[PDB]
Design an enzyme around this catalytic site. Structure first.
Site, mmCIF file in Angstrom:
data_model
loop_
_atom_site.group_PDB
_atom_site.id
_atom_site.type_symbol
_atom_site.label_atom_id
_atom_site.label_comp_id
_atom_site.label_asym_id
_atom_site.label_seq_id
_atom_site.Cartn_x
_atom_site.Cartn_y
_atom_site.Cartn_z
ATOM 1 N N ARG A 161 -36.176 9.769 7.452
ATOM 2 C CA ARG A 161 -34.951 10.116 8.149
ATOM 3 C C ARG A 161 -33.800 10.143 7.146
ATOM 4 O O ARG A 161 -33.479 9.122 6.532
ATOM 5 C CB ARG A 161 -34.691 9.103 9.272
ATOM 6 C CG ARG A 161 -33.584 9.486 10.241
ATOM 7 C CD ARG A 161 -33.377 8.360 11.273
ATOM 8 N NE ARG A 161 -32.688 8.868 12.454
ATOM 9 C CZ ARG A 161 -31.538 8.395 12.919
ATOM 10 N NH1 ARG A 161 -30.937 7.372 12.321
ATOM 11 N NH2 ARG A 161 -30.997 8.942 14.000
ATOM 12 N N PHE A 173 -24.331 9.553 5.894
ATOM 13 C CA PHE A 173 -24.582 8.309 6.610
ATOM 14 C C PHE A 173 -25.590 7.480 5.819
ATOM 15 O O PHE A 173 -25.216 6.476 5.198
ATOM 16 C CB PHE A 173 -25.069 8.602 8.036
ATOM 17 C CG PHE A 173 -25.351 7.374 8.866
ATOM 18 C CD1 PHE A 173 -24.816 6.134 8.529
ATOM 19 C CD2 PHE A 173 -26.169 7.461 9.984
ATOM 20 C CE1 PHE A 173 -25.088 5.004 9.296
ATOM 21 C CE2 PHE A 173 -26.454 6.336 10.745
ATOM 22 C CZ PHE A 173 -25.912 5.105 10.397
ATOM 23 N N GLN A 224 -33.183 6.674 5.161
ATOM 24 C CA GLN A 224 -34.043 5.626 5.706
ATOM 25 C C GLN A 224 -35.505 5.858 5.330
ATOM 26 O O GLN A 224 -36.015 6.979 5.407
ATOM 27 C CB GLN A 224 -33.925 5.529 7.233
ATOM 28 C CG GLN A 224 -34.791 4.438 7.843
ATOM 29 C CD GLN A 224 -34.528 4.266 9.321
ATOM 30 O OE1 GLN A 224 -33.530 4.768 9.846
ATOM 31 N NE2 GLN A 224 -35.432 3.572 10.008
ATOM 32 N N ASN A 275 -34.014 -2.294 11.872
ATOM 33 C CA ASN A 275 -34.634 -3.201 12.823
ATOM 34 C C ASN A 275 -34.558 -2.566 14.202
ATOM 35 O O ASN A 275 -33.942 -1.516 14.389
ATOM 36 C CB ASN A 275 -33.960 -4.595 12.800
ATOM 37 C CG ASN A 275 -32.493 -4.552 13.195
ATOM 38 O OD1 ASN A 275 -32.135 -4.008 14.237
ATOM 39 N ND2 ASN A 275 -31.626 -5.135 12.349
ATOM 40 N N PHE A 322 -32.624 1.059 4.807
ATOM 41 C CA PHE A 322 -31.884 2.285 4.562
ATOM 42 C C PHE A 322 -30.909 2.106 3.419
ATOM 43 O O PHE A 322 -30.371 1.021 3.206
ATOM 44 C CB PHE A 322 -31.139 2.782 5.798
ATOM 45 C CG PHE A 322 -30.233 1.758 6.443
ATOM 46 C CD1 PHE A 322 -30.745 0.824 7.327
ATOM 47 C CD2 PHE A 322 -28.870 1.781 6.202
ATOM 48 C CE1 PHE A 322 -29.912 -0.101 7.943
ATOM 49 C CE2 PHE A 322 -28.043 0.867 6.805
ATOM 50 C CZ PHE A 322 -28.563 -0.072 7.684
ATOM 51 N N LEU A 327 -22.290 -1.615 11.349
ATOM 52 C CA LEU A 327 -23.579 -2.269 11.234
ATOM 53 C C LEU A 327 -23.457 -3.735 10.849
ATOM 54 O O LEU A 327 -24.444 -4.460 10.953
ATOM 55 C CB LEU A 327 -24.446 -1.526 10.215
ATOM 56 C CG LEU A 327 -24.613 -0.036 10.536
ATOM 57 C CD1 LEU A 327 -25.350 0.672 9.404
ATOM 58 C CD2 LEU A 327 -25.364 0.137 11.851
ATOM 59 N N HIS A 371 -27.478 -5.815 10.908
ATOM 60 C CA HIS A 371 -28.507 -5.434 9.950
ATOM 61 C C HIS A 371 -28.278 -6.191 8.651
ATOM 62 O O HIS A 371 -27.152 -6.232 8.142
ATOM 63 C CB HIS A 371 -28.478 -3.919 9.712
ATOM 64 C CG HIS A 371 -28.878 -3.125 10.919
ATOM 65 N ND1 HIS A 371 -30.171 -2.696 11.131
ATOM 66 C CD2 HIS A 371 -28.166 -2.722 11.999
ATOM 67 C CE1 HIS A 371 -30.233 -2.047 12.282
ATOM 68 N NE2 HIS A 371 -29.033 -2.052 12.829
#
EC number: 5.2.1.8
Length: 164
Positions: A54, A59, A62, A101, A112, A121, A125
């Site tokens: 991904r 952004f 991942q 997660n 990521f 986040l 995370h």
């Protein structure tokens, strides 16, 4: 004293370049050790040959699903999932390395690389490392992503291990 691990990235099998990460073993030792051991493969499994499934430009990138290659798999060195260690470190800009997660205390092997500041986040995370060399290679990986996260070519960790 903090370990350094590298990923040699490939794009449809063609070499792209090398990214190295510093892992914050001093602040998140359990999290950092999971990523380190999966990068050397010393426990018999790990990231070598797995893909970045991904990539959303602006952004994050991942990866780390080395069992189903699509975001639904992976596992830690400690078992299927381990706890959120602490949230000392924050998502302060591009180059941050953080755990993916599926809720509290569900870390496995997916991670990521942030390519933006992602402060929403924080506290959800676990941040555990940062790009040291090759941020330009991460930026090149971003050009193969798309708004929905599907990549236009296969991005693979062709080789990976520990540098110091």
């Amino acid at each position: 004293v903090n370990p350094t691990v590298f990923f040699d990235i490939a794009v449809d099998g063609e070499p792209l370049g090398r990214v190295s990460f510093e892992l914050f073993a001093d602040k998140v030792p359990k999290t950092a050790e999971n990523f380190r051991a999966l990068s050397t493969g010393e426990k018999g499994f790990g990231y070598k040959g797995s893909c970045f499934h991904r990539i959303i430009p602006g952004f994050m990138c991942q990866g780390g699903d080395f069992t189903r290659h699509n975001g639904t798999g992976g596992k830690s060195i400690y078992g299927e999932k381990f706890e959120d260690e602490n949230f000392i470190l924050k998502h302060t800009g591009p180059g941050i390395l953080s755990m993916a997660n599926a809720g509290p205390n569900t870390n496995g092997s997916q991670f990521f690389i942030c390519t933006a500041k992602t402060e929403w986040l924080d506290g959800k995370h676990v941040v555990f490392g940062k790009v040291k060399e090759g941020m330009n290679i991460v930026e090149a990986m971003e050009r193969f992503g798309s708004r929905n996260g599907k990549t236009s070519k296969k991005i693979t960790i062709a080789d990976c291990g520990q540098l110091e």
